[PDB]
Design an enzyme around this catalytic site. Structure first.
Site, PDB file in Angstrom:
ATOM      1  N   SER A  60       0.810  -1.228   0.000  1.00 27.92           N
ATOM      2  CA  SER A  60       0.000   0.000   0.000  1.00 27.92           C
ATOM      3  C   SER A  60       0.835   1.265   0.000  1.00 27.92           C
ATOM      4  O   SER A  60       0.342   2.333  -0.365  1.00 27.92           O
ATOM      5  CB  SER A  60      -0.966   0.025   1.183  1.00 27.92           C
ATOM      6  OG  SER A  60      -1.904  -1.024   1.050  1.00 27.92           O
ATOM      7  N   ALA A  61       2.098   1.136   0.391  1.00 25.84           N
ATOM      8  CA  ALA A  61       3.002   2.276   0.429  1.00 25.84           C
ATOM      9  C   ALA A  61       3.208   2.931  -0.934  1.00 25.84           C
ATOM     10  O   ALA A  61       3.596   4.100  -0.994  1.00 25.84           O
ATOM     11  CB  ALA A  61       4.332   1.873   1.065  1.00 25.84           C
TER      12      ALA A  61
END
Length: 313
Positions: A60-61
């Site tokens: 998700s980064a």
């Protein structure tokens, strides 16, 4: 030398505590000056310098970059509400942690929507997204001076399945080191301009390159504040006295938390990864958020940065 010994010590201590409490195999912390790219701390659990050697799927980064690119190119705006229902491409599902029937771009950031991020990415061609990831430094060696340094992995766009463009947009199928990932965050903190990273003090921001319009970077920093406020995935990383722009990640098992503060005029980027937590939670918010909170608050105090809102703790 850019390292700050008080920050290095804080990072190392808070990292070891988290790794212990969550019964994890290892972890890493990078702290950067958000304005110059110089490295303020680089800490690892015993062994190799994982921050530079270990490529990870960022999960998700990576989402803030895809969202930023869609905004920057006018493929979406802050008013659009997207259908975020889970779907498949052939047999492979694309779904979020919850079924959100719809979300605007703020919500896609706030709720960390795989579905929403993939639909934005899909408004670009595969080659366009490939060059964008390359632009971010994925697959490009940093030449930090450390041995064992990974370049990461960016597969040639001609080979991508449609599902692979989708999964890359939410952080699987491409890889980069924690240092490479922390560097990518300078494009958000330094108003659209990606910075190189340095182990020496920089009088001024070095020669960078523009990835996003400044307006885009400012808007995205503001969206990322929703991650650390109620309703966001990353409330564990809120810091007293400050608005914090951040992003959680839970890579299928690596818990990541990365963010910057003060959100409007950032001074520090903190990036934390905890490898294979086995106790007291799994997710980036729960596991990596608490050490992020302590290292960020501590770093801001160490560097003499005044709170932008009154303290309550």
């Amino acid at each position: 030398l850019s390292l700050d010994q008080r920050i290095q010590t804080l990072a190392y201590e808070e990292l070891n505590k988290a790794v212990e409490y969550h019964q994890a195999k290892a972890g890493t912390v990078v702290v950067l000056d958000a304005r110059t790219g110089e490295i303020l701390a680089l800490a690892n659990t015993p062994g190799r310098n994982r921050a530079v050697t270990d490529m990870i799927e960022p999960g998700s980064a990576i989402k803030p970059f895809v969202i930023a690119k869609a905004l920057d190119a006018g493929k979406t705006d802050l008013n659009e509400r997207l259908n975020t229902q889970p779907y498949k491409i052939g047999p492979s599902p694309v779904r979020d942690t919850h079924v959100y029937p719809s979300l605007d771009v703020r919500g896609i950031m706030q709720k960390s929507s795989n579905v929403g991020t993939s639909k934005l990415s899909a408004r670009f061609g595969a080659e366009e997204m490939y060059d964008f990831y390359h632009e971010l430094g994925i697959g490009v060696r940093m030449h930090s001076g450390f041995p064992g340094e990974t370049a990461g992995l960016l597969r040639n766009w001609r080979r991508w399945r449609p599902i692979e463009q989708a999964t890359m947009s939410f952080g699987y199928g491409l890889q980069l080191s924690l240092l490479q990932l922390a560097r990518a965050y300078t494009a958000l903190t330094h108003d659209g301009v990606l910075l190189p990273l340095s182990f020496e003090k920089q009088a001024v921001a070095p020669q960078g390159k523009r990835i996003f319009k400044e307006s885009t970077a400012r808007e995205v920093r503001n969206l990322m504040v929703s991650v650390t406020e109620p309703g966001g995935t990353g409330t564990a990383g809120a810091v007293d006295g400050f608005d914090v722009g951040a992003k959680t990640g839970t890579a299928r098992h690596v818990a990541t938390f990365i963010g910057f503060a003060p959100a409007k005029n950032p001074r520090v980027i903190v990036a934390v990864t905890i490898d294979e937590p086995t106790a007291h939670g799994y997710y980036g918010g729960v596991v990596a958020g608490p050490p992020f909170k302590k290292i960020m608050g501590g770093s801001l105090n160490i560097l003499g940065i005044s709170p932008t809102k009154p303290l309550t703790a």
